[PDB]
Amino acid sequence: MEDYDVGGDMEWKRPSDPKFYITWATGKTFRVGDELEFDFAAGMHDVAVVTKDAFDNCKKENPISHMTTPPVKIMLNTTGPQYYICTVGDHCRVGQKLSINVVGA
């Protein structure tokens, strides 16, 4: 397995550039068995696991999951698309979201 720290050195924050997490995710292989870790300061950001449509429109309500205490560690147990957004303020709207596609171990 591999434990990915989302955003690397920038961690999970409000990006200056909307494509920042698209860039971070590019080229990486997310496999069943891998872990994602979102590091952030309590109350400044959070993590919501959401559907594709909620990702696309930054819909914060009624997510699949929602975590407010950092660090958020999520195991990738199934293959297919996974979407994450931060629901604090305008962060999602400016790019604080991540889309990945999990493949077999």
Ligand SMILES: [Cu+2]
């Ligand atoms: Cu945020």
